[PDB]
Design a protein around this ligand. Sequence first.
Ligand SMILES: Nc1ncnc2c1ncn2[C@@H]1O[C@H](COP(=O)(O)OP(=O)(O)O)[C@@H](O)[C@H]1O
Ligand SMILES: Nc1ncnc2c1ncn2[C@@H]1O[C@H](COP(=O)(O)OP(=O)(O)O)[C@@H](O)[C@H]1O
Ligand SMILES: Nc1ncnc2c1ncn2[C@@H]1O[C@H](COP(=O)(O)OP(=O)(O)O)[C@@H](O)[C@H]1O
Lengths: 90, 93, 97
Amino acid sequence: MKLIVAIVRPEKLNEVLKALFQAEVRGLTLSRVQGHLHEKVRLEIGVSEPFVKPTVEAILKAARTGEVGDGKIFVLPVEKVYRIRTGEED
Amino acid sequence: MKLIVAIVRPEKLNEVLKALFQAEVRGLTLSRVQGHGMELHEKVRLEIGVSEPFVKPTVEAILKAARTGEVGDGKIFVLPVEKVYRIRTGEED
Amino acid sequence: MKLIVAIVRPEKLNEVLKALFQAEVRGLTLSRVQGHGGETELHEKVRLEIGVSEPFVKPTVEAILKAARTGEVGDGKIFVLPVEKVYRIRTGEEDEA
Ligand SMILES: Nc1ncnc2c1ncn2[C@@H]1O[C@H](COP(=O)(O)OP(=O)(O)O)[C@@H](O)[C@H]1O
Ligand SMILES: Nc1ncnc2c1ncn2[C@@H]1O[C@H](COP(=O)(O)OP(=O)(O)O)[C@@H](O)[C@H]1O
Ligand SMILES: Nc1ncnc2c1ncn2[C@@H]1O[C@H](COP(=O)(O)OP(=O)(O)O)[C@@H](O)[C@H]1O
């Protein structure tokens, strides 16, 4: 499992979410933040190893505008993930 | 240390916070977020730094308190932390 | 690469941003959160999220520690998280070392 944290332009959020959905990426969490200050959207997406590239690519393509300020995408290691509904791991 | 990131239902937050307090967990950060399991749902994200010996007990407290058994309960991520510092003292841990 | 997560007092934000820019740090993300320390109900804090290369880890941490300190309970904490890789959306450039 990996945890993807992406910072994108609010104006590109809808396009980004559509792209993720298209790529079969459904689980995600997002919040509004400020960055350098300008408003931005932060997405945190927990994915299995096979979905790292597809997720990263969906965002790269949908979030780019070509102008400085487009954002970044971090891929973080995750040691364990638990599903609250079942109380079981993964 | 590890960093616990839990996404829970808003209606379960008080129960979660009570469970953490009872499990001796005092240090934590939280905020409101939106999530999908276009339909976004309000959720609450908790970020808790906890040392290895106590990761399991802390995760368990959240699991029990946040559960409803219905789809949408959320997930808990446990991330590795290379280093942690206390600002009040600068202490490397 | 590393991802620095710092929780600081709102009152210390401007001083922290100042020290960071001075340390040649510029790109970063921040948000308002509610928190509580290890003592004994929640208080507002500012959460900084800073992606940096290995050479900038020590300098970034040093800047926050020096500027965000009041010496009183509630000062916050700094987490240095491992990053597998980072992509710049505009250029598609990837960093890993
Ligand atoms: N190093 C970083 N750490 C954390 N967040 C960052 C970092 N760099 C950029 N960001 C986030 O992404 C936003 C835009 O980044 P920016 O570097 O301007 O993109 P671009 O590569 O197009 O110039 C920043 O305002 C912030 O929200
Ligand atoms: N893989 C994930 N990555 C990031 N956040 C997630 C992920 N899965 C779920 N979430 C967060 O947990 C909330 C509830 O998700 P979940 O319990 O899986 O409901 P569902 O069963 O419909 O997927 C989501 O709204 C989101 O905030
Ligand atoms: N273990 C933790 N996990 C996540 N956030 C924490 C943790 N401990 C403290 N915080 C954040 O820092 C704030 C408390 O500051 P802290 O440094 O613990 O006080 P003190 O300077 O007395 O050590 C909390 O309100 C929260 O925002």
